Amino acid sequence: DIEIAQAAKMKPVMELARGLGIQEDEVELYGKYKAKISLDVYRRLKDKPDGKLILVTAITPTPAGEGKTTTSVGLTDALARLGKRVMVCLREPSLGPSFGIKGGAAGGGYAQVVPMEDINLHFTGDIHAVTYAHNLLAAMVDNHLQQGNVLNIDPRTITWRRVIDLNERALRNIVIGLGGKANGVPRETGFDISVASEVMACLCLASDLMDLKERFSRKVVGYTYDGKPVTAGDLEAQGSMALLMKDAIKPNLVQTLENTPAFIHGGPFANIAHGCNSIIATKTALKLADYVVTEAGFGADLGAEKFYDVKCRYAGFKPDATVIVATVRALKMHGGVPKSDLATENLEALREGFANLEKHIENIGKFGVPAVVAINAFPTDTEAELNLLYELCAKAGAEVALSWAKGGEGGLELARKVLQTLESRPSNFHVLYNLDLSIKDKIAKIATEIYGADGVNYTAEADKAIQRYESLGYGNLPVVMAKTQYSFSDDMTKLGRPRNFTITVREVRLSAGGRLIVPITGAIMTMPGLPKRPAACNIDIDADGVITG
Amino acid sequence: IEIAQAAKMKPVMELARGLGIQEDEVELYGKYKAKISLDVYRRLKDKPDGKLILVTAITPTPAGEGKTTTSVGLTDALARLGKRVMVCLREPSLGPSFGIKGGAAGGGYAQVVPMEDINLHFTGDIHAVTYAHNLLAAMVDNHLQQGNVLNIDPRTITWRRVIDLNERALRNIVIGLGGKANGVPRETGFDISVASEVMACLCLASDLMDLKERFSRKVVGYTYDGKPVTAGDLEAQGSMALLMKDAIKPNLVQTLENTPAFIHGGPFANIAHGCNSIIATKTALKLADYVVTEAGFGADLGAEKFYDVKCRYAGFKPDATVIVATVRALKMHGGVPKSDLATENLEALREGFANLEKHIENIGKFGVPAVVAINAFPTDTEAELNLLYELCAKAGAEVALSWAKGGEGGLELARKVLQTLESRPSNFHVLYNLDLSIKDKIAKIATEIYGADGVNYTAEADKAIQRYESLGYGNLPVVMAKTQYSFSDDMTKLGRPRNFTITVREVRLSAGGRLIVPITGAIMTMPGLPKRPAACNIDIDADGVITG
Amino acid sequence: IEIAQAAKMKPVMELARGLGIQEDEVELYGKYKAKISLDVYRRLKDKPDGKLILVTAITPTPAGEGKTTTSVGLTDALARLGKRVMVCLREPSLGPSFGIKGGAAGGGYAQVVPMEDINLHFTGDIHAVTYAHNLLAAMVDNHLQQGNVLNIDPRTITWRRVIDLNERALRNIVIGLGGKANGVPRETGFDISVASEVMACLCLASDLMDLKERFSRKVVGYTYDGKPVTAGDLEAQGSMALLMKDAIKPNLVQTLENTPAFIHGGPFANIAHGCNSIIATKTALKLADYVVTEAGFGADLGAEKFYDVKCRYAGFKPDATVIVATVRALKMHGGVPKSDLATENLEALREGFANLEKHIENIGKFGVPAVVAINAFPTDTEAELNLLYELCAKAGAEVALSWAKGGEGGLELARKVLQTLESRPSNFHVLYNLDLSIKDKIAKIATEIYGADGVNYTAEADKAIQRYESLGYGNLPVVMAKTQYSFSDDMTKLGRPRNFTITVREVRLSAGGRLIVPITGAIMTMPGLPKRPAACNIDIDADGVITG
């Protein structure tokens, strides 16, 4: 009953891989409870049909929390108890947070994927592969300048920054190549958290290694003194980068507290990227299982949208259903109630905050997939409140979840409601926008139809970038909005369902290993810092076990 | 090609068994690489250790040492003689792979495997070091940002950062730019990961709780009052320890002749001692009759620090010591041009021998028996070898073809080591004492070993040493950070230079270990990529790698 | 060529005499340039001042204003009518000379001299500012180096450095590198010298003791607690004052028509008020019946700050105000292309007139009489002029050829100014009050003058203003740092834009004066050299200069 104190009985992953149809020679162990699986499992099982794909997302996140991954693990466990063949595909957490604000569980309570400690730490070294693949390219960029700059790159135009998996403000802005002609070419850069690396996004969206290698070659690192693009491909570094990702390309098999098979592979930001786990895990899971549960970072206005418009578009997936998690509290915060009085009953605030959930329902509906609401049960909630929220959910199926404090058992209702909609409401999935539209038409389609905004404004900088990109041939790519996750708008104070507002993009970046990144506010916290009181200052490993993780 | 030497390995779990390791004391990383719990040792704490065979070599030359190969090729041969032996080598840096290419983990049929893994991520040992080092750094910079409670002077901070790639651009940099929200501007830099004091501590730690405490002693800088502020004062030893939880365990792999091969650690040899970890060798000791391990650079640096630092702390007492050398090698010390190592020249071979001979004596100075080894090379003529044979008139000597014959080309030398390890009982002792003065320690290492008539200390060195000894780090060991291509600090003085001197220009302190006194610019703690990098050539087929 | 206009000057000492200045109140810098003691004023403190003729102009355009010329050409004409008048202009930055060439200190036969000196070192006024600014900076950095007794946060320091050259490279830099002995690393930069708050203070100071105290109020940054640390807290006002001992005195020179010409000061017009010093004009006042002075940019910026800042502090009460404008100028505001200002177009001339007319009204808003001026240009046809003549249906209007006729082409306009200065008695008042809110001040300047329906303040602006007013600098004047090519912040909106808004993005504080609220990127406080600089062409013969 704290989540870490819940280290208990796991079954060898080989056992799990065998009972899933994976041959022993496609399993590479990392201890008895972790394994990477060959992309051969999908290569030979590709002509078989896919199981059902269930995306779990949530309402606009608030400081009161909602418990998104907890529901994903619990739902999966519930489908398992109900006898369904099922797996969960989740993202690998960044190492950094483990030392700043303490590492959390892959879920919570009795709804989590273990081994916990390993997953919050080095796990199987995937992030390390990204870190070095990404940094090798930076070093090849700087060595190429040092070597005479044949490609004639303007160092001052280099956008490929460096990366590292810890929270360090100090590396945000820095100057490299100092010391004299023997120590490189002086320039300004900095570091981003590793999981923010475009490399981490390439992994999450690649078909396999060769695809991963090609996407790498397409990565722009800077421009010539003429404005012409310069790619890693131009520096002949994709092969080497691919080599570093040799093993990281394989999804990792772990399990739930109740032994339900699970894939954890990849884990990118959800503002500067799509916030989804890899495609190679999900598609492998769709073959090995009849039901696959996966999730997406931030609320449905970002994660769900990008899961649909980016991950599924590339992979060919066609979501069968989507579950949206909400709590009475988080909802009452969208209704005006302060974090301090969230325990006190307030049907009016609950009814007004519902407006937020109501908007996500409708939105999910614009993609052709039926939605199901998952109420993450909380002690202080009252019957009057839950009951109000249940009937308000007049549009889709609603079921309460007690997966946190009851494991799969607390999610049987939700499981049965999902199965119920999977049988009578087949989906008709379709992305939100055609790729042939203008970059601004995509931005507007998303801002208009999903956020509920009136329109979009652009700064001079944003306009120049959109034109340079479009004439440079990157205007037909998908669009990944980098905005605040705490509101449908770009103003994190406007909770609930803000109306009559405008979205403003001030800068537009490019990830040639995917698409366009237009950010609004300071969504550029690409490198979180450490608190005055670093969880690390308390961390200590006993003569045997750990403590304070 | 050496890589082509990808042929038949064996499930390490088996070896772990055919050694006496409980299954519950093994964690796999595939079926051909695995770690071993520190429980193996603690329980077999009283069991009788085996013998120790510290392989070493002459003074390196652009001709070919043979240090590493001969270390495995000997293990093959030894165990090929129905003996219980392992190999405790060092894990190579990841960087060289994409710059000048990755090499064999030995040589010919004496290379430990799997090769590729070893030259890349392996079991992620280096990454672990990389993050324990960088988190400390992040804690240092975030501390300033909070209010500098410890009143640190950013400008004095010695704790750099780390990455395991060859990047010159990161040698000198300016961090903390941006404003009151992005930290405090200061000058730092990056060093290759395997140069980390964290790698050192790892390679010189008993058990986590040990490695931890060592971390807590590391100095990251000073306050404005000249007062040292350690990692311990930052409360970072715990977290640093946790990141190492796995890396602390040694990695069990094997030879091409399925001989148990232990690969754990990989520090620098100049700024450090260039030895594989202790927890590893002290383990192989329990699990084997004989343990064949090596050290970086020539015996004048590695062996010396191996005896004075590793064996000192660990409690080891080396029973033997093999020193490698080729014909071409010594010849260069005889003035033989690199493009002139093809032709015969017994006169030079004899002159250069002084190199080989000089080491022979230093070895003997550690009350540890000694034995010569000769990497058989195609050009070396009968005449040459014949001469060199008798030249070693002072201690055991055997030729070795462990390169193109595997454990076979090693039988000869193999018998000699046993023969002498059975008849030549050592009384191992440290070449100097831990209470002597830093200078007197440097001296004893300089005179008796390097052969310097004396030592010089610049104004900088003096101020530092006085600070240190006045701070408390005076009773510590000494790691000579100097050129390796010469007994002296002059990399041009080949052979056995005489009537020379040694000048210590700088002096760095390593709380988690000892004292580093550098001579010349041995500060190349971050090598750089060439104009024709291997990264530009490395590729990975829809199946396998081709160019690494 | 205008430079060729090097012909007959007169020993300023004489002029100083033919004005009533005691010889002991003049310090020469050759026989054609000299300073005047601040004693002239203090003694003639009660003597009756003369009249004030603040020349100004429309909204600048890439066609040709005529601001400066018409200011001297008028003085010639005025004094050419047996009147006691001087000219109080501004000293130009040294930088433009080596980048885009140095220009006339007026125009045609209305340029003050000696030209060369004026565009170079002159009497070293700027150098003096340059060093009082930089010494403060050095005192700030040396303070940190000592122990930061005032607990300053280097990262907050707003006090930049200064140089009087166009150097982009110095806009953003990192200083204090090197170690505990070379200062504290921080991010600063350089601004052109004439952008210095020191230049401002100079151009807005009564007497040394005044200028001094002002210096002591300047804010160089804040402590870690957000507490302001001024130059006064650094005890730098004294030294800063001494470096200015000479620069405080105004410089007496002359026109081509030997009319007394005062050139002292030269601040920025956007980040500052663009007016020659006060101590100067308040001097020429005593020593003359009429004083002809000007202000930078169009009347929407210069005149406004001239009235609200200069006249406010000094106590002046402008009796007149001339606003210049050419035919081609207004036409561009009518949409007339630059390469299309050759042909006639009365329809555009009429439309663009809105520009001219809009100013006319703002002028009148300061209870100060107004009068139009037209720089006669070769292409302007009779038709065009004829139209523009009557278009000014609201206040006095006269054509001027002070360019190619000297004080002659100015007679016409000259009479009109007297005619109206004699019949049109002003009741000069500030357009706003010193107790209003910063926003309400910005507003009143934005509405009544700029013509903005309102003003917007970003998150940054708001936080700043609140800080300031919460710090005590709320009852201060406001200097609109915005584009000058448009009444609005949009440099493309020519003419008299309507139904627009103004958005203050940033807000800088100038303790030694007022508050600067910038709109667009008017932060070009350090212009840069072109690819074809005049420096590459300037030369000096074994006799004279050729290319400057």
Nearest CA to B259 out of B290, B294, B281 is that of B290
Exposure string over A275-288, b if 16+ CB within 10 A, otherwise e: bbbbbbbbbbbbbb
Q: How far apart are CA A482 and CA A480, in angstroms?
A: 6
Asked whether residue B61 is marked as a ligand-binding residue, the answer is yes
Distance from CA of A544 to the nearest CA of B (A): 9
Q: Which residue has tokens 């102009």?
A: C57
Phi and psi torsions of A88, nearest 5° = -120, 140
Which structural technique was applied? X-ray
Nearest CA to C289 out of C46, C34, C62, C49 is that of C49
Q: How far is CA B136 from the centre of its chain?
A: 24
**Taking the CB of residue B492, how many other CB atoms lie within 10 A of it?**
9
Q: Give how far Cα C5 sits from Cα of C105, C108, C377, C406, Å.
A: 12, 8, 20, 12
Q: How far apart are CA A131 and CA A197, in angstroms?
A: 8
Cis peptide bond upstream of A63, omega within 30: no
Q: How many CA atoms lie within 13 A of C320 on its CB side?
A: 28
Q: What is the DSSP letter of C9?
A: -
Q: Which of C147, C186, C224 sits opposite B185 (nearest CB)?
A: C186
**Taking the CB of residue B48, how many other CB atoms lie within 10 A of it?**
8
Number of H helices, E strands in chain C: 18, 21
Residue of C nearest to B180 (CA): C155
Q: How far apart are CA A362 and CA A356, in angstroms?
A: 10
Distance from CA of B179 to the nearest CA of C (A): 5
Q: Do A241 and A137 meet the contact criterion of CB atoms below 8 Å apart?
A: yes
Asked whether residue B64 is marked as a ligand-binding residue, the answer is yes
The residues in A 84-113 lying below 8 A from B, measured between CB atoms, are 95, 99
CB contact under 8 A, A182 and B170: no
Q: Are strands A111-114 and B85-89 parallel, antiparallel or unpaired?
A: unpaired
Q: Do B113 and B8 meet the contact criterion of CB atoms below 8 Å apart?
A: no
CB contact under 8 A, C185 and B174: yes
Q: How many residues does chain B have?
A: 548
Task: Write the DSSP string, B270-336.
Answer: SSS--B--HHHHHHHHHT-SEEEEEBSS-TTTHHHHIIIIIHHHH----SEEEEEE-HHHHHHHTT-
Q: Does B154 touch chain C (CB under 8 A)?
A: yes
> Does the annotation mark B31 as catalytic?
no
Exposure string over B316-327, b if 16+ CB within 10 A, otherwise e: bebbbbbbbbbb
Task: Write the DSSP string, B456-511.
Answer: EE-HHHHHHHHHHHHHTTTSS-EEEE--SSSSSS-TT--SS--S--EEE---EE-S
The residues in B 219-258 lying below 8 A from A, measured between CB atoms, are 234-239, 241-243, 245-246
CB contact under 8 A, A30 and B28: yes
Residues of C in contact with B146 (CB under 8 A): none
The residues in B 285-324 lying below 8 A from A, measured between CB atoms, are none
Q: CATH number for the A126-244 domain, one of 3.30.1510.10, 3.30.1600.10, 3.40.190.10, 3.40.630.30?
A: 3.30.1510.10
CB contact under 8 A, B185 and C180: no
Alpha helices for B334-437 (secondary structure H): 346-364, 382-391, 411-423
Q: Which of B159, B215, B306, B377 is catalytic?
A: B377
Domain B125-243: assigned CATH number: 3.30.1510.10
**Taking the CB of residue C444, how many other CB atoms lie within 10 A of it?**
16
In sequence order, what are the beta bridge partners of A293?
A: A54, A88
Q: Which of B56, B59, B69, B188 is catalytic?
A: B69
> Does the annotation mark B200 as catalytic?
no
Query: Strands, DSSP E only, in B140-234?
Result: 161-163, 173-175, 186-188, 190-192, 219-222, 228-230
Asked whether residue B82 is marked as a ligand-binding residue, the answer is no
The residues in B 109-138 lying below 8 A from A, measured between CB atoms, are 120-121, 124, 127-128, 131, 134-135, 137-138
Q: How many residues does chain C have?
A: 548
Q: CATH number for the C437-526 domain, one of 1.10.132.20, 3.20.20.70, 3.40.605.10, 3.10.410.10?
A: 3.10.410.10
What is the helix (H) or strand (E) element at residue B85, kind and residue range? strand B85-89
Q: Which of B177, B180, B184 sits opposite C156 (nearest CB)?
A: B180
CB pairs under 8 A between A and B: 208
Resolution of this structure in Å? 2.5
SS3 A227: coil
Task: Write the DSSP string, C271-282.
Answer: SS--B--HHHHH
Active site residue ranges of C: 67, 69, 90, 101, 269, 297, 377, 403
Q: Give how far Cα A272 sits from Cα of A264, A525, C15, Å.
A: 20, 10, 71
Number of H helices, E strands in chain B: 18, 21
- Please list the residue range(s) of chain A that carry CATH number 3.10.410.10: 438-527
Q: How far apart are CA A167 and CA A192, in angstroms?
A: 9
Residues of B in contact with C184 (CB under 8 A): 155
Q: How far apart are CA B450 and CA B56, in angstroms?
A: 16
Q: How many CA atoms lie within 13 A of C518 on its CB side?
A: 16
> Does the annotation mark B377 as catalytic?
yes
SS3 A422: helix
Asked whether residue B247 is marked as a ligand-binding residue, the answer is no
In sequence order, what are the beta bridge partners of C457?
A: C504
Q: How far apart are CA A354 and CA A324, in angstroms?
A: 13
Q: Do A258 and A130 meet the contact criterion of CB atoms below 8 Å apart?
A: no
CB-based contacts of B541: which residues, under 8 Å, 6+ apart? none
Q: Which of A30, A142, A539 sits opposite B167 (nearest CB)?
A: A142
Distance from CA of B505 to the nearest CA of C (A): 19
Q: Which of B153, B154, B179 sits opposite C155 (nearest CB)?
A: B179
> Does the annotation mark A102 as catalytic?
yes
CB pairs under 8 A between B and C: 30
Q: How far apart are CA C159 and CA C315, in angstroms?
A: 30
Residues of B in contact with C180 (CB under 8 A): 153, 155-156
CB contact under 8 A, C180 and B153: yes
- Please list the residue range(s) of chain B that carry CATH number 3.10.410.10: 437-526
Measured over the CA atoms of residue A242, residue A246, residue A247 and residue A250, the dihedral's sign is positive
Distance from CA of A340 to the nearest CA of B (A): 27
Task: Write the DSSP string, A485-547.
Answer: TTSSSS-TT--S---S-EEEE---EE-SSS-EEEE-SSTT--S----SS-GGGT-EE-SSSEE
Q: How far apart are CA C183 and CA B420, in angstroms?
A: 63
SS3 C398: strand
Q: CATH number for the B1-124+244-436 domain, one of 3.30.300.30, 3.40.50.300, 3.90.1300.10, 2.60.120.380?
A: 3.40.50.300
Q: Do A493 and A336 meet the contact criterion of CB atoms below 8 Å apart?
A: no
CB-based contacts of A311: which residues, under 8 Å, 6+ apart? A204, A205, A274, A276, A279, A282, A317
Q: Do B493 and B61 meet the contact criterion of CB atoms below 8 Å apart?
A: no
Asked whether residue A66 is marked as a ligand-binding residue, the answer is yes
CB contact under 8 A, B186 and C185: yes
Q: What is the DSSP letter of C184?
A: -
Q: Give how far Cα C223 sits from Cα of A502, B310, B544, C134, Å.
A: 38, 51, 60, 21
Residues of A in contact with B540 (CB under 8 A): 209, 213, 239, 242-243, 246
CB contact under 8 A, C174 and B179: no
Q: Do C253 and C112 meet the contact criterion of CB atoms below 8 Å apart?
A: yes
Residue of C nearest to B222 (CA): C180
Q: Do A486 and A302 meet the contact criterion of CB atoms below 8 Å apart?
A: no
Q: Does B146 touch chain A (CB under 8 A)?
A: yes
Query: Strands, DSSP E only, in C51-104?
Result: 51-57, 85-89
Cα-trace Rg, chain C: 23
Q: Which token pair is A363?
A: 């939105």
Q: How many residues does chain A have?
A: 549
Encode B3-41 in three state secondary structure: CCCCCCCCCHHHHHHCCCCCHHHEEEECCCCEEECCHHH
Amino acid at B201: C
Sheet of B508-509, strands arranged across: B478-481, B515-518, B508-509
Q: Does domain A438-527 have CATH number 3.10.410.10?
A: yes
State the first-to-last Cα distance of chain C, in angstroms, to the nearest integer.
Answer: 12
Measured over the CA atoms of residue A184, residue A190, residue A195 and residue A199, the dihedral's sign is negative
Asked whether residue A284 is marked as a ligand-binding residue, the answer is no
Backbone conformation region of residue B531, classed left if phi is above 0, alpha if psi is from -120 to 50, else beta = alpha
> Does the annotation mark A68 as catalytic?
yes
Q: How far apart are CA C385 and CA C406, in angstroms?
A: 20
Residues of B in contact with C185 (CB under 8 A): 154-155, 174, 176, 185-187
Nearest 10 degrees: CA dihedral of C133, C138, C144, C145? 180
- Please list the residue range(s) of chain A that carry CATH number 3.30.1510.10: 126-244
Nearest CA to B260 out of B1, B22, B67, B21 is that of B21
Q: Which of A187, A404, A506, A526 is catalytic?
A: A404
Asked whether residue C65 is marked as a ligand-binding residue, the answer is yes
The residues in A 163-222 lying below 8 A from B, measured between CB atoms, are 164-179, 182-185, 188, 209-210, 213
For helices B411-423 and B69-79, angle between their N-to-C axes, nearest 10 degrees: 80
Asked whether residue C321 is marked as a ligand-binding residue, the answer is no
Architecture of the structural domain at A1-125+245-437: 3-Layer(aba) Sandwich (3.40)
Q: Do A238 and A251 meet the contact criterion of CB atoms below 8 Å apart?
A: no
Q: Which of B137, B146, B535 sits opposite A240 (nearest CB)?
A: B535
Q: Give how far Cα A67 sits from Cα of A30, A386, B94, Å.
A: 29, 16, 40
Distance from CA of A241 to the nearest CA of B (A): 9
